[PDB]
RNA sequence: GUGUUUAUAGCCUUGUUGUAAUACGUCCACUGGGGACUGAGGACUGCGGCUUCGUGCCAAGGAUGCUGACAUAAUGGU
């Protein structure tokens, strides 16, 4: 079952490399930020740290009830 | 109101105080963001750049990667 049974149009070597996301200078860790979409739209939450593209964000769960969540920048 | 010549304002002209600054024109193989449309091709060759050299890496002969939602729905057609 292993030998290719068809033309096997193997994709050409694509010269695309993964590089780190350049987030905005204003999305530093610790800055208060307003959520725009999702079930928690309109809430204000604190940016703990930046993931590769998203921001690991949370409002103090005793304050606005927004748990440890990810948010797209 | 008449005539004045810095008076208790100063104006213009002239050379002139250390030089300038700015605007406009032009150029940078200088640089930082925002938006939109496209992804044709399909092993490898090539031209280049990094790299002490690299079955090396790269934005260099055309898009890839990471995710999320749905079968009783989603999406489109008539």
Give the Cα separation of A52 and A20 in Å (integer). 7
Round and report the angstrom distance from CA (A38) to C1' (B47). 49
Round and report the angstrom distance from CA (A22) to C1' (B51). 26
HSE-CB at A61 with a 13 A cutoff on CA atoms is 3
Give the Cα separation of A22 and A15 in Å (integer). 20
At how many Å resolution was this determined? 3.0
- The approach used to solve this structure was cryo-EM
Give the Cα separation of A20 and A23 in Å (integer). 9
HSE-CB at A34 with a 13 A cutoff on CA atoms is 2
Q: Is the CB of A17 under 7 A from strand B?
A: yes
Give the Cα separation of A31 and A24 in Å (integer). 12
Strand order, beta sheet including A54-58: A32-34, A44-50, A54-58, A69-72
């Amino acid at each position: 079952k292993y030998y290719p049974a068809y033309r096997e149009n193997v994709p050409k070597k694509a010269r695309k490399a993964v590089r780190p996301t350049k987030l905005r200078a204003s999305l530093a860790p610790g800055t208060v930020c307003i959520l725009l979409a999702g079930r928690f739209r309109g809430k204000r939450v604190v940016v703990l740290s930046q993931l590769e593209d998203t921001l690991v964000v949370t409002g103090p769960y005793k304050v606005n009830g927004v748990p440890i969540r990810r948010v797209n920048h």
